[PDB]
Amino acid sequence: MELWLVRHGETLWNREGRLLGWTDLPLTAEGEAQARRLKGALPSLPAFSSDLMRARRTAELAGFSPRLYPELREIHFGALEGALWETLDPRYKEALLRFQGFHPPGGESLSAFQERVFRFLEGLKAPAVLFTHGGVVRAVLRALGEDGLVPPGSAVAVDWPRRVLVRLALD
Amino acid sequence: MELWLVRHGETLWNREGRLLGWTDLPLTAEGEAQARRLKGALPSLPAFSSDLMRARRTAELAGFSPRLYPELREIHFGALEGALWETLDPRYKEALLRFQGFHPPGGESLSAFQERVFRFLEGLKAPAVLFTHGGVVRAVLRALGEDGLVPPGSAVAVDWPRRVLVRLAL
């Protein structure tokens, strides 16, 4: 099914290089700017969004009124929430780089995260726009055999669970 | 949906020609070498693996950290575990080659095997790499109208449940 996944606009921790999961931070001015640029660039399909503020706000600025689902949240980094990527222990770094065997204390494992994300996608009964996070987009892109790195406020359309259709970036 | 079926590397019973099911044998040195060679070939899709040592070790050396599922185990041969294929009683060997029905003493029936395997496959929610055994790979290939012979340490990619995409025999 055609799904459009949108990575929310930037927050302060994006420029600061800190892990941002369930910590509810707001979009920055540029983050809201990135979000407004999405209006008119996305199809008028039913919309779903992480309930986290930065996602909800991106959806709103993009001209949508999404139904909220915590299932679309970024992975829960547990004790690693807010940690600087730079000083992250090499084992955690490579776990995240290779996207496997990641189990932060007090948090969610990558395997649990993937099950949550794919279970949500499996339940969609028609094309939709999903306002979510970098990790969710990455999980989907990697499952489709592609690099999952996409700029904040950008989008990707896929034919789940078969292939990527288009990557949309706006300047 | 893209599935990669990987047959774990060789054990002593592979080269000895013995039925290997739930007997938890380790990989030989060559078996580990075969596993390492897969690292530069297999796509980085979510990974799952039989919980048996030889499959787990293959996944590890191939550069993966799989979720463990006993449903991916080879069939349980029961009293036939370790039995030489060459001297296998014609009544067992026939059953196995007819693919119509099979239930070794103290073992698992082919119907239970298949229930187990296909339940797992049908439950997958996204593309994946599956570290498993010859019988499982066989079962999948046959379900797609193909011949289920892949060397140890090799893989086959399929568009489940439609057709085979490519075979990777190293």
Ligand code: NA
């Ligand atoms: Na035996």
